[PDB]
Amino acid sequence: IRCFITPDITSKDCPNGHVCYTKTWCDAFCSIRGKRVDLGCAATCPTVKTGVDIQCCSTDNCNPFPTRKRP
Amino acid sequence: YRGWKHWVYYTCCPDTPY
């Protein structure tokens, strides 16, 4: 359910979601175009650390201003 | 020409799942 703007892509709401899981994770490389960091839509706050900056928030409007790219 | 993109990701226009 629309937890932030959009997970991988643009079109719809994360098919898997509960908490606005602001996941700034790179795994090792970060192979997608150039993620705009944290969005979420997953479950719990099980780690939130290491090389994974996670701003897991269970608020209603976790998505402050509809800006994606910008200029 | 033609080959536009299947590139957007982060919103602007349609999808990047193709």
Curated annotation (Swiss-Prot), chain A:
For this UniProt entry, the molecular function terms from Gene Ontology, in alphabetical order, are: acetylcholine receptor inhibitor activity; ion channel regulator activity; toxin activity
Keyword Disulfide bond in annotation: yes
Entry function: Monomer: binds with high affinity to muscular (alpha-1-beta-1-gamma-delta/CHRNA1-CHRNB1-CHRNG-CHRND) nAChR (tested on Torpedo californica, Kd=0.2-4.5 nM) and neuronal alpha-7/CHRNA7 nicotinic acetylcholine receptors (Kd=13-105 nM). Also inhibits GABA(A) channels.
This one is known as: Alpha-cobratoxin
SUPFAM superfamilies given in the database record: Snake toxin-like
Sites marked Binds to both neuronal alpha-7/CHRNA7 and Torpedo AChRs: 25, 27, 29, 33, 65
Q: Where is the site described as Binds to alpha-7/CHRNA7 AChR found in this chain?
A: 28, 35
What domain of life is recorded for the organism? Eukaryota
Q: Which organism is it from?
A: Naja kaouthia (Monocled cobra)
Record PTM: In homodimer alpha-cobratoxin, selective reduction of Cys(26)-Cys(30) in one subunit does not affect the activity against the alpha-7/CHRNA7 nAChR, whereas its reduction in both subunits almost prevents alpha-7/CHRNA7 nAChR recognition. On the contrary, reduction of one or both Cys(26)-Cys(30) disulfide bonds in the homodimer considerably potentiates inhibition of the alpha-3-beta-2/CHRNA3-CHRNB2 nAChR by the toxin.
Which GO cellular component terms, listed alphabetically, does the Swiss-Prot or TrEMBL entry include? extracellular region
A family per Pfam: Toxin_cobra-type
Swiss-Prot record, chain B:
Q: Where in the cell is it found?
A: Postsynaptic cell membrane; Cell membrane
Cystine connections: 12-13
| Domain of life of the source | Eukaryota
The record's family statement is: Belongs to the ligand-gated ion channel (TC 1.A.9) family. Acetylcholine receptor (TC 1.A.9.1) subfamily. Alpha-1/CHRNA1 sub-subfamily.
Subunit and interaction comment: Pentamer of two alpha chains, and one each of the beta, delta, and gamma chains.
Q: What does this protein do?
A: Upon acetylcholine binding, the AChR responds by an extensive change in conformation that affects all subunits and leads to opening of an ion-conducting channel across the plasma membrane.
Protein name, entry field: Acetylcholine receptor subunit alpha
State which gene encodes it: CHRNA1
